Every structure is written in structure tokens, then in C-alpha cells.
Write an enzyme that holds these catalytic residues in place. Structure first.
Site, PDB file in Angstrom:
ATOM      1  N   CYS A 112      -3.380  49.709  64.356  1.00  0.00           N
ATOM      2  CA  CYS A 112      -3.523  49.080  63.031  1.00  0.00           C
ATOM      3  C   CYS A 112      -3.554  47.539  63.032  1.00  0.00           C
ATOM      4  CB  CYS A 112      -2.392  49.540  62.102  1.00  0.00           C
ATOM      5  SG  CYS A 112      -2.015  51.328  62.158  1.00  0.00           S
ATOM      6  N   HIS A 238      -1.213  45.188  55.902  1.00  0.00           N
ATOM      7  CA  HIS A 238      -1.788  46.445  56.328  1.00  0.00           C
ATOM      8  C   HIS A 238      -1.363  47.378  55.196  1.00  0.00           C
ATOM      9  CE1 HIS A 238      -1.078  50.285  58.912  1.00  0.00           C
ATOM     10  NE2 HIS A 238      -2.294  50.291  58.400  1.00  0.00           N
ATOM     11  N   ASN A 268      -3.839  55.129  54.250  1.00  0.00           N
ATOM     12  CA  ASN A 268      -3.711  54.301  55.449  1.00  0.00           C
ATOM     13  C   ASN A 268      -4.968  54.485  56.322  1.00  0.00           C
ATOM     14  OD1 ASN A 268      -2.936  53.340  58.047  1.00  0.00           O
ATOM     15  ND2 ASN A 268      -0.774  53.828  57.606  1.00  0.00           N
TER      16      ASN A 268
END
Lengths: 312, 312
Positions: A112, A238, A268
């Protein structure tokens, strides 16, 4: 020299999955999922659409937005943890699909945090004076590694991609400061299970690390930039969980009307999460030339990255 | 600034596999393998020894050779196409195992050209003035992805790892010139089958491409360095095939003694290929401070990378 984003683009696939969908086979509910993650819907790529396909849609938009031709690209870097194959890489595939010259292309793995690592890497190359237009992509098809029988992860991940062209920008603009790090001791908390091929996660352990590191890293890059929370127009973390984002937001000091939130529509999306968020802020008129933003992320590894950028 | 190799180390696993081993499962002979590939033996990692372990062994050697402490490393970059998992990456695993700071660590994918790409990447970072000791590793456990029913590839691959510490070196020394490239239209000739997990190859096409690029890219970096074939003490190509290497040697018009050859003892170890060969030349007294060498790799993608380095 001032190195920044010369063009930006992002893409999410067609199929939208709402929360209600998981009740058909899991012990969940819209209320439960919303309450624990802030997610309402997420996008999954079709069975014939792989990570490279998502990356390509984001990349053509970033190139068009930069006002350059595919021939102008002198390097392609792709941040992904779910590339179609280890080789040829998604970057190799973009080289041919985009019709660029036979330029250097490679994928970088930092989960990520990948988009951040790659933009910074591009900065170094551009800085050398030997590169002028580097295509950097953050793409992931997480549906490929999601375990649908695991209610904890099944409802968290989505698919998507974001891309920028890194190169010289006008005075005062661009990447001002940045920070990158990793902590392998947290490896057992978030990883791809070898013989199952599915993402496995210790939710509480990742939650604790995410909230502290995203707040700490954000604070450091703002100071190294010689700024204060008050000078930041947008905080773009994020998009993993709205509760993590909110804690990190507090620990930072910035007001919520200043934090981008898009996890509600995408879930996500790992490396593509910050770019998808940026895209929303651009389209809703919330991000303008000369605005100062802070991007920050964490990821499996564990890894983290953060940067301050003067937009335009 | 002069950036180069401050430390070097290499490692190949214990189990040695001779050519005669394959006759029990395939239609092979030592004569055939020898003539088609130049390989006599190759090394395979134990079942409980993954790519990260190979990388850890090479890394400790490079750190000692550089005369630094783990705490001194400020970035880790692992070039591999066979990392234990996509996250945490081998680089993350080394951050923990080597006991360094919580430094940036990532894996870069460019198949057999990965070590070259990664060393060049580290160079950009050291050149920015922010990093001084970057650990770059080239590691692969191809034995994990070899189709044991396909005689043409089962006999070509081996396991190994190489590592260097990239940082400033004395005047005139280090990485003098370089180039990297890729051509995705060659993806179908060498790739990892997405459904089977095994390496797929079109030998004829890769042979044609490898010979041409190994020679062409070598010439280009020698010229960029304003040197000539004669000023080169050693030519160290990716050890993919003795026929490919010689064919590219004859094209260079260079002596057998100016080209390092280790495919006979290690087989093709992808990203570890060049460092294991360098290790051999150091051990045999063929490479010493101030020698000027040419490294050139090429592989799946397709990708290639080459550079000229003045040793020390």
C-alpha cells in the site's frame, strides 16, 4: 530543480459491490461493515480485466492530462502487489500497450506504500537530469487475493489504479519533502499466504501501527517542509479504514474538512488508494494549483511513506 | 559524484545438482545438456531455504566486505522475480534479519536485468545526497518455478544471490555509464504462466534477442564511457547460455579470457547470475581494483540493462 506531478489520472473498474451483497454468504450487515470500516461500496474488476488493464486506463488519462505523447515517456514504474505476473511485469506490458519507446520499465513492491515509494524513486531519476517524463502507476486488483470466506477481509478490499507523470514543474511546486520506512517485524501481521494465495491479516496489530505511523510520518514531512498543520490544504491518507484515518487525522491536528475521504466508495485499494482519493478531490473542485497537500500511507511489510506536495 | 560498489558478496546454496540427475525424469544426457547450454552443474536451495535466505547470506557478506555496520545501511533494494511473497517483500525481511534501522526497503522486478536496474536505482538515491550506503541484492530461487517435465528449461535454472553496498567511492572509480531498456512485445517469449506458476520459454526467440542485445547494449555503454573494447578488462554477461554468451563474445571480437564464464557451475540464476560470476573472478584473482568491467544482463519482459564500472 523542482520535480512534481505533470499529469494525473485514476481508474476504478465497472462492477460495484455494495455492502448488502456479503450477507448472502457471510455473517455481516451493511450497518456492521459501515460501522467498522466506513465502506459502503467497492469496485471489483471483471474476470478478464487484470491489474495491467486497470493500470493502462489510469496511465492513458495521466498522459493526456500532462499534454505529452507516449514517445515523451522515458521510464515507467509500477507500484503493485498483485501484478499479472512476476515477468513480464505490468510496467513491461504498459511499455508495449501505451506504445512508448523501449524505455526502462519495472514494478516496485512496497504494498500500500508503493505509489509513494515509486514517485520518490522517479524523483531521483528526474533529478539526475537524465529523465524528464516518468510514468508512475499505483495499481492493484485485490479481489484476486481476497479470501471471500473470511468476513474480516472479504469486505475490505477493492480494485483500482492511479497514475502520474513525474517531471520538472514550475517554481515552488512539486514534492517538497518526503519520508519512507519499513519494519519487517510486522511482516507476520499482514501477508500473502503462500499456499492459499490469499491475504491474511492481524487486524488489531495493523490498526495500531497504521494510526501511529500515519500520524507520526505526516507530522515529520510537514516539519521537514518547514510548515505546520495550518499550511496544509488537504490531508490524503491511504484509504484503508475510516476509523484509522480519523485517528491519524486527530493525531495530526488537521480539521476533517481538510482530510480526503473516498474509502466509502472504493474500500481499500492498496497502491491505488491515494490516487483515487486525489481524483475525487480534483473532480469535486477541492484541490487546486498551488494547494499544499500531504500524502501518507502504510502497508504490508510493514512499510510506510509520506510526502508534502505543492500542487500544479 | 563517483558512486560505486563499496562492498560485495555472493552466495549459492549447498545442494549441487549434476547433469546426470535429470535422466531419471527426463529424456536427457550430460552430453546434450552440455552442448545445448554449457551447464555442468547448478545449485538448488533446500526446501526450507527460500529466496530471502539466499539474499540474507549474500547481504551479510557484502556488509562485511564494505566494512560497515547494519545500522549504517539507509535503504535496501532487492531485485528478484521469485520473492518469498509479494508482501512482506524479501527487502522487508532483510530489514528485520540484518537488523538495520527502519529504512526504506523494496523489491524491484525486471527479471534477469533486475540487479542492473536496482544498482542504477540506488545510484540515483546516493546521487541526491540523501543516502550513502544502499544494499542492493540480486536473488532468485528459480528451482521454485521450474517445470520439471520440460527438458528445455528444467536443466537451465539454478538458485543463488548476490549483493553489493552502493555508495561513494574514490575519484574515477564506480559506475561510469549505463543504460536500461525494455520491449514488452517480447513478453510472450519468456514469462511466468499465471495459472501454472511455471516458467514458459520460446528458446529460439530468446536466443535471437539475447545475442543481439547483449552485444548491442555492451557496445553502447562502452562508447558512452568514451572507452573502447580494448580498455575493458572483463565482460560479465548474464549467464543464460554459453552459446548465447559466446555468440555475443564473437560479435564483440573479444578474447575468451576477457569474458567471465560461470554458467558451467551455476546454471542460469536470473538476477544472481552476474554477481555469482563476479564472485568467481574475484576468488580466482582475475578482477582487482581499478580494472574496468562491463556488466550486461537481459531477460523476461523483455528487459536489458548494462553498465561500465571501474572496480574498487
Amino acid at each position: 530543480m523542482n520535480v512534481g506531478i505533470k499529469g494525473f489520472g485514476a481508474y476504478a473498474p465497472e462492477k460495484i459491490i455494495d455492502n448488502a451483497y456479503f450477507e448472502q454468504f457471510l455473517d455481516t450487515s451493511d450497518e456492521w461493515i459501515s460501522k467498522m470500516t466506513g465502506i459502503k461500496e467497492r469496485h471489483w474488476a471483471d474476470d478478464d480485466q487484470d491489474t495491467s488493464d486497470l493500470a493502462y486506463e489510469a496511465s492513458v488519462k495521466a498522459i493526456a492530462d500532462a499534454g505529452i505523447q507516449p514517445e515523451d515517456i522515458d521510464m515507467i514504474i509500477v507500484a503493485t502487489a498483485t501484478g499479472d505476473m512476476p515477468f513480464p511485469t505490468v510496467a513491461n506490458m504498459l511499455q508495449e500497450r501505451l506504445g512508448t519507446g523501449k524505455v526502462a520499465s519495472m514494478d516496485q513492491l512496497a504494498a500500500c506504500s508503493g505509489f509513494m515509494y515509486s514517485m520518490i524513486t522517479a524523483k531521483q531519476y528526474v533529478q539526475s537530469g537524465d529523465y524528464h517524463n516518468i510514468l508512475v502507476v499505483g495499481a492493484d486488483k485485490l479481489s484476486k487475493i481476497t479470501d471471500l470466506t473470511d468476513r474480516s477481509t472479504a469486505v475490505l478490499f477493492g480494485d483500482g489504479a492511479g497514475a502520474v507523470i513525474i517531471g520538472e514543474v514550475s517554481e515552488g511546486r512539486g514534492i517538497i519533502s518526503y519520508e519512507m520506512g519499513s519494519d519487517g517485524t510486522g511482516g507476520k501481521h499482514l501477508y500473502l499466504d503462500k499456499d492459499t494465495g490469499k491475504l491474511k491479516m492481524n487486524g488489531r496489530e495493523v490498526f495500531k501501527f497504521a494510526v501511529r505511523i500515519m500520524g507520526d510520518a505526516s507530522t515529520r514531512v510537514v516539519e521537514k517542509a518547514n510548515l505546520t498543520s495550518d499550511d496544509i490544504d488537504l490531508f490524503i491518507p491511504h484509504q484503508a479504514n475510516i476509523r484509522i484515518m480519523e485517528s491519524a487525522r486527530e493525531r495530526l491536528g488537521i480539521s476533517k474538512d481538510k482530510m480526503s475521504v473516498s474509502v466509502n466508495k472504493y474500500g481499500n485499494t492498496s497502491a491505488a488508494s491515494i490516487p483515487l482519493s486525489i481524483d475525487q478531490e480534483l473532480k469535486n473542485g477541492k484541490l487546486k494549483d498551488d494547494d499544499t497537500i500531504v500524502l501518507v500511507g502504510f502497508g504490508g511489510g510493514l512499510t510506510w511513506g509520506a510526502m508534502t506536495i505543492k500542487w500544479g
